[PDB]
Amino acid sequence: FDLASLAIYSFWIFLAGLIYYLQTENMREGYPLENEDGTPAANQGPFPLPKPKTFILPHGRGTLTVPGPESEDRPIALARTAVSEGFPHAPTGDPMKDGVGPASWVARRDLPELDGHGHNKIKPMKAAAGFHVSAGKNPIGLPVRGCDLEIAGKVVDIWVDIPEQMARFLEVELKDGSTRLLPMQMVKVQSNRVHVNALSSDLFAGIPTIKSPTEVTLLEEDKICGYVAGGLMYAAPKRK
Amino acid sequence: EYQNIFTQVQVRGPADLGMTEDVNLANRSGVGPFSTLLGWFGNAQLGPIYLGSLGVLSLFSGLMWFFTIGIWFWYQAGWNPAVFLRDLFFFSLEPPAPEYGLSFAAPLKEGGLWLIASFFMFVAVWSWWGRTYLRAQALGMGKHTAWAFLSAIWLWMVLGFIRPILMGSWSEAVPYGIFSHLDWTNNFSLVHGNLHYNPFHGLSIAFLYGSALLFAMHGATILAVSRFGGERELEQIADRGTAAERAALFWRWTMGFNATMEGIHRWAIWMAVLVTLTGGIGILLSGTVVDNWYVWGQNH
Amino acid sequence: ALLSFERKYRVPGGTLVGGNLFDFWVGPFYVGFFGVATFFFAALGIILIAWSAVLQGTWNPQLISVYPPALEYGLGGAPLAKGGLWQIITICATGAFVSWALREVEICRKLGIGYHIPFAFAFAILAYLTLVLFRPVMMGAWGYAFPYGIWTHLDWVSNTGYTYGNFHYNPAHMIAITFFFTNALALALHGALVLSAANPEKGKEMRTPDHEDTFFRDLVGYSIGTLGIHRLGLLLSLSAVFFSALCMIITGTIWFDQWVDWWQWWVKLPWWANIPGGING
Ligand code: BCL
Ligand code: BCL
Ligand SMILES: CC[C@H]1c2cc3[nH]c4c(c3C)C(=O)[C@H](C(=O)OC)c4c3nc(cc4[nH]c(cc(n2)[C@@H]1C)c(C(C)=O)c4C)[C@@H](C)[C@@H]3CCC(=O)OC/C=C(\C)CCC[C@H](C)CCC[C@H](C)CCCC(C)C
Ligand SMILES: COC1=C(OC)C(=O)C(C/C=C(\C)CC/C=C(\C)CC/C=C(\C)CC/C=C(\C)CC/C=C(\C)CC/C=C(\C)CCC=C(C)C)=C(C)C1=O
Ligand SMILES: COC(C)(C)C(=O)C/C=C(\C)CC/C=C(\C)CC/C=C(\C)CCCC/C(C)=C/CC[C@H](C)CC/C=C(\C)CCC=C(C)C
Ligand SMILES: CCCCCCCC/C=C\CCCCCCCC(=O)OC[C@H](O)CO
Ligand SMILES: CCCCCCCCCCCC[N+](C)(C)[O-]
Ligand SMILES: CCCCCCCCCCCC[N+](C)(C)[O-]
Ligand SMILES: CCCCCCCCCCCC[N+](C)(C)[O-]
Ligand SMILES: CCCCCCCCCCCC[N+](C)(C)[O-]
Ligand SMILES: CCCCCCCCCCCC[N+](C)(C)[O-]
Numbered sequence: 001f002d003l004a005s006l007a008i009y010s011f012w013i014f015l016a017g018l019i020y021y022l023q024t025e026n027m028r029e030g031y032p033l034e035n036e037d038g039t040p041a042a043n044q045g046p047f048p049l050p051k052p053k054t055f056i057l058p059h060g061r062g063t064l065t066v067p068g069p070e071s072e073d074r075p076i077a078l079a080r081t082a083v084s085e086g087f088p089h090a091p092t093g094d095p096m097k098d099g100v101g102p103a104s105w106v107a108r109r110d111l112p113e114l115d116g117h118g119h120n121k122i123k124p125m126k127a128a129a130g131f132h133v134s135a136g137k138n139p140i141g142l143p144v145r146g147c148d149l150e151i152a153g154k155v156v157d158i159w160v161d162i163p164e165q166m167a168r169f170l171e172v173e174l175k176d177g178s179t180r181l182l183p184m185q186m187v188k189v190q191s192n193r194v195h196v197n198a199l200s201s202d203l204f205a206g207i208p209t210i211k212s213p214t215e216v217t218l219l220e221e222d223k224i225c226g227y228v229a230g231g232l233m234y235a236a237p238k239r240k
Numbered sequence: 241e242y243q244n245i246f247t248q249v250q251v252r253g254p255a256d257l258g259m260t261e262d263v264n265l266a267n268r269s270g271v272g273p274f275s276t277l278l279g280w281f282g283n284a285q286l287g288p289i290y291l292g293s294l295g296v297l298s299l300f301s302g303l304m305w306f307f308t309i310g311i312w313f314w315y316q317a318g319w320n321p322a323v324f325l326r327d328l329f330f331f332s333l334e335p336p337a338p339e340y341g342l343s344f345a346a347p348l349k350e351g352g353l354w355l356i357a358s359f360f361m362f363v364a365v366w367s368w369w370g371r372t373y374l375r376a377q378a379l380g381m382g383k384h385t386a387w388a389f390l391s392a393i394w395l396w397m398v399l400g401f402i403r404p405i406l407m408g409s410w411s412e413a414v415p416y417g418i419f420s421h422l423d424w425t426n427n428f429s430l431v432h433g434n435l436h437y438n439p440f441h442g443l444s445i446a447f448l449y450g451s452a453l454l455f456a457m458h459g460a461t462i463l464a465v466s467r468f469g470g471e472r473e474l475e476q477i478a479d480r481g482t483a484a485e486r487a488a489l490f491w492r493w494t495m496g497f498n499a500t501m502e503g504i505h506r507w508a509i510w511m512a513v514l515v516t517l518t519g520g521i522g523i524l525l526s527g528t529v530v531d532n533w534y535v536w537g538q539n540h
Numbered sequence: 541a542l543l544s545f546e547r548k549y550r551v552p553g554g555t556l557v558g559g560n561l562f563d564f565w566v567g568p569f570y571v572g573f574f575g576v577a578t579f580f581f582a583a584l585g586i587i588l589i590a591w592s593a594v595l596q597g598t599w600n601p602q603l604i605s606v607y608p609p610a611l612e613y614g615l616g617g618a619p620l621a622k623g624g625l626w627q628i629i630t631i632c633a634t635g636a637f638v639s640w641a642l643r644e645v646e647i648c649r650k651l652g653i654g655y656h657i658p659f660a661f662a663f664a665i666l667a668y669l670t671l672v673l674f675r676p677v678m679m680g681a682w683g684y685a686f687p688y689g690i691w692t693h694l695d696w697v698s699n700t701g702y703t704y705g706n707f708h709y710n711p712a713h714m715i716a717i718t719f720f721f722t723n724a725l726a727l728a729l730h731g732a733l734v735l736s737a738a739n740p741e742k743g744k745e746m747r748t749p750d751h752e753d754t755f756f757r758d759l760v761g762y763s764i765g766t767l768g769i770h771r772l773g774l775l776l777s778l779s780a781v782f783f784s785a786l787c788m789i790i791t792g793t794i795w796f797d798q799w800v801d802w803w804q805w806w807v808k809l810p811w812w813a814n815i816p817g818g819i820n821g
């Protein structure tokens with residue numbers, strides 16, 4: 001029972017408590033577990049639910065307390081494929097339009113994210129005084145091409161994260177004159193074109209639209225990004 | 241498929257002068273140039289930097305440490321620039337010999353200079369710690385950075401100050417040299433019966449390896465959901481989005497459990513600080529309480 | 541059981557093999573074909589470990605050790621008790637690691653996310669194969685691989701390193717270490733920065749990412765950004781492992797002397813090589 005033996009025993013005790021604390025802290029979202037019918041699950045695990053904490057959000061946007069009563073706050077167009085638990089739930093309609101699977105989106109607040117000074121974090125470059133392309137290929141004017149090798153539109157503007165000085169969306173003008181946003185992370189800027197592998201040219205029109213031409217909300221961002229990511233699975237039929 | 245490792249199109253605007261809060265704007269420099277080079281991988285803006293009394297003190301004190309070791313290397317090199325560059329990695333500023341114990345009466349060339357350099361390094365590191373605390377305070381932020389820094393300071397304090405004192409001799413401290421401080425590390429293990437069998441050293445390794453495991457996991461995860469804006473982690477904490485959900489579901493389906501967007505950063509900060517926290521303990525017990533770790537290990 | 545938000549993501553599709561045959565979950569775990577493969581290899585390797593323990597004569601996990609064949613076996617097969625079990629367990633381990641990664645790929649497809657995670661895991665796999673496959677083969681014997689034992693495999697590290705003096709002087713070893721230390725440095729800072737912004741001083745509102753930027757510009761005059769730090773962390777951890785495999789694949793294959801001798805090309809440059817004085821004069 002020398003001093004070194006007690007240090008290492010003490011530490012293992014400390015570490016078991018640290019793990020217990022870290023795991024409960026990581027249960028402030030998505031818990032309690034549910035059955036596939038929405039009801040609470042009987043077996044919740046050995047770790048209990050943590051006690052609520054409160055974040056005071058800046059810009060008078062309220063406060064968040066987690067854990068709290070959870071809600072999807074949106075309809076889910078899926079149906080059970082098995083009586084037993086553990087099997088896929090099959091889309092009942094058009095999964096890209098119904099926003100399920102890889103096309104899923106979360107019902108975030110229908111407000112734009114703000115920067116430290118209370119201004120919209122993301123802005124079209126035509127509304128961002130002083131911003132420009134400093135390196136690489138400027139995609140404005142370039143045609144946008146889908147996974148079917150057809151042209152869907154041309155890039156008309158870039159939406160930039162101003163505090164971070166980063167391109168986040170390409171505003172693409174469609175054949176009918178309207179525009180859509182494309183995640184910067186899902187496009188390939190080439191010399192003479194912008195290639196989007198996730199969608200076919202005739203699926204750009206289906207990208208959810210924004211209600212203001214100079215701002216995009218967190219809800220809109222989730223709907224846009226989910227739709228485009230869902231094309232990798234659901235637009236593959238006509239992928240050249 | 242675009243992978244988001246390097247920026248495709250850089251954009252640049254008016255420099256960001258930053259948040260004000262209670263920062264004393266008198267001590268902020270001007271903005272530096274933009275770096276297209278860094279812009280491919282991160283932000284291209286350089287500066288501004290805050291520079292108060294502590295920063296100046298840390299900076300000046302840190303350069304005195306640097307210069308102290310330097311003139312000693314030029315003296316070992318016989319003042320020959322050719323010899324200086326040849327044997328740069330072999331030069332070493334060693335602590336006082338065991339004979340002097342914990343005395344500061346060691347002549348400069350027999351560990352007296354090592355004591356001066358250690359004083360400047362001591363002032364530079366601790367003033368820099370105070371800097372990480374007050375910079376966060378001035379912005380109203382938590383002090384998680386200063387506390388994580390203490391963990392690294394702990395191991396440095398044990399190696400060069402706490403343990404030598406408990407051993408009763410400055411000669412137990414580490415020398416200032418590239419190759420010399422590697423040799424010190426190798427001899428420390430041989431003398432103490434193989435550190436592989438110091439359990440706090442094995443724990444330290446588990447957390448070092450685990451820090452690379454966790455950052456690869458976390459970095460790769462955030463990039464894989466950056467198509468959903470996953471890197472904007474603070475707003476994902478205040479308003480969970482599909483980025484945070486897919487990230488959690490990937491790991492739940494893979495290994496059976498998962499984190500939250502906030503909770504993963506608690507896993508991270510503890511994984512990293514436990515490296516130097518356990519390591520400092522293992523060193524502090526070597527030679528004070530345990531002489532031979534292998535032999536000690538065979539009784540437990 | 542599911543997370544409150546999980547159901548909408550549990551759709552069919554994304555598999556690479558078997559269509560919908562293995563497209564289901566057991567509790568939280570996704571199966572898929574490579575979930576079955578993983579289970580097969582893992583179950584088989586664990587039996588062979590228990591079998592080695594019986595041949596060894598102990599059931600204490602701290603003493604079990606499966607050794608590779610003796611050098612005299614070269615790169616041929618060995619009898620089960622004389623290195624064969626190590627050989628079969630190395631096959632099973634490889635099967636499990638690779639199956640695990642392809643399962644992760646199937647989970648990326650169902651969730652519509654990038655493939656960065658299995659890509660990063662493949663670096664760890666490459667490092668395992670460097671030590672148990674590439675380096676033994678280039679050296680001509682399985683015995684150069686390390687034994688599967690909790691403590692015996694640390695002895696192997698020490699024996700292998702001291703065969704070349706102080707392994708510290710392996711220059712690729714230095715680089716790998718630098719990335720390991722820098723990675724833990726960067727992980728600690730990143731965790732602390734997010735938490736300091738989400739959990740500010742008492743009586744304060746949640747901070748913004750602009751505060752995170754400002755804090756680091758105030759501290760060191762530069763902020764890499766919210767995206768760049770995750771890029772950086774991925775890079776520091778993989779680079780560390782890359783140079784680790786590199787520092788070993790060259791040890792015993794193209795370099796055979798003590799690693800401190802490698803640094804003589806600098807010391808013995810014929811111009812200053814003979815200038816008197818210094819450490820090497
Ligand atoms: C990497 C270069 C060297 C090496 C050098 C060292 C040194 C030096 C040390 C270790 C240590 C450990 N090593 Mg080793 N080790 C190597 C290869 C391996 C491999 C492998 C398959 O390649 C494995 C699985 C291990 C496993 C282990 C653990 C017993 C221990 C803590 C690791 C850890 O937490 O890492 C980070 C990972 C995590 C935090 C995630 C969790 C991982 C858990 C802990 C893995 C448990 C594996 C289990 C014991 C073995 C398989 C069980 C099967 C059911 C049969 N080593 C090679 C040969 N390893 C330390 C120790 O205490 O050893 C006694 C130590 O000091
Ligand atoms: C006396 C010993 C020698 C020495 C000799 C060696 C030797 C010999 C080697 C190293 C290697 C390493 N040394 Mg050295 N080294 C020494 C001193 C040090 C010091 C120090 C501070 O003194 C440090 C910091 C290091 C640092 C390091 C790293 C660069 C590297 C280990 C990481 C690695 O490769 O991971 C690679 C990662 C892996 C192997 C993990 C792979 C995991 C697989 C894919 C999955 C496993 C799954 C698991 C079984 C599942 C469990 C599931 C359960 C649910 C838990 N050495 C001294 C001088 N060192 C090693 C190296 O570079 O290897 C390539 C190596 O072989
Ligand atoms: C590449 C950078 C770092 C990294 C990254 C990394 N590791 C990863 C991943 C990533 C990105 C994953 O996605 C994957 C994962 O799911 O993690 C939770 C994983 C993973 N990294 C793990 C471990 C691990 N990673 C390590 C290191 C690293 N991982 C690097 C430092 C280390 C060490 C020693 O440093 C370990 C021990 C696992 C927890 C997990 C992979 C789990 C897996 O493959 O599961 C399927 C296999 C089994 C369930 C077991 C099979 C059993 C075998 C048949 C028998 C065992 C034989 C073995 C040779 C025994 C030897 C023991 C002795 C050496 C003591
Ligand atoms: C930002 O977003 C993030 C998250 O969400 C918001 C996260 O959630 C995570 C995950 C990370 C954590 C939860 C932290 C804890 C992890 C650590 C410390 C790593 C170390 C991990 C471990 C020690 C666990 C290892 C576990 C296993 C290997 C599982 C055991 C294996 C089993 C049971 C077998 C697997 C099952 C099958 C193959 C299928 C079954 C087969 C049949 C035939 C039935 C990350 C990285 C993240 O960035
Ligand atoms: C042209 O070149 C010039 C001359 C200009 C140069 O400047 C060249 C300079 C260099 C090339 C610098 C080279 C630098 C090195 C080789 C540094 C290597 C450093 C290490 C390996 C780090 C080891 C540090 C470990 C120790 C022993 C740290 C001591 C810290 C203690 C906690 C402090 C102890 C304090 C003491 C004893 C007393 C002081 C006061 C107190 C209140 C405690
Ligand atoms: C161009 C360089 C100028 C001088 C540099 C000084 C030396 C820094 C050394 C190591 C720390 C590595 C830095 C990375 C740590 C960043 C932590 C983090 O999470 O940052 C995210 C972002 O900055 C929040 O918005
Ligand atoms: C590195 C050690 C990791 C240990 C983590 C242990 C925590 C496992 C939590 C399982 C419970 C999860 N569940 C069923 C409640 O969702
Ligand atoms: C010695 C290392 C200690 C580990 C550091 C862990 C960070 C948690 C501390 C929370 C600090 C919060 N606070 C009150 C200062 O804002
Ligand atoms: C924060 C995550 C904690 C993970 C803990 C991992 C434990 C690794 C086991 C190492 C065993 C070392 N020891 C004491 C036997 O020498
Ligand atoms: C010693 C390390 C072991 C940690 C491995 C964790 C196993 C899986 C975690 C629990 C998931 C399964 N569960 C409890 C939800 O049924
Ligand atoms: C190494 C890559 C993975 C593929 C190898 C598959 C071998 C194991 C066979 C398991 C499948 C068995 N079964 C009956 C479910 O098809």
Ligand SMILES: CCCCCCCCCCCC[N+](C)(C)[O-]
Pocket residue numbers: 615616617627628630631634635673
């Ligand atoms: C299923 C994946 C196979 C990859 C190769 C596995 C490497 C293990 C090598 C063991 C050598 C044993 N044997 C019988 C071939 O001599």
Ligand SMILES: CCCCCCCCCCCC[N+](C)(C)[O-]
Pocket residue numbers: 638641642645655656658659662665666
């Ligand atoms: C040395 C070869 C074996 C490495 C394991 C291969 C499987 C890892 C998963 C593939 C990674 C490629 N990617 C980016 C398409 O996911």
Ligand SMILES: [Cl-]
Pocket residue numbers: 290291292293294295296371
């Ligand atoms: Cl300051």
Ligand SMILES: [Fe+3]
Pocket residue numbers: 458462473505730734770
């Ligand atoms: Fe993060």
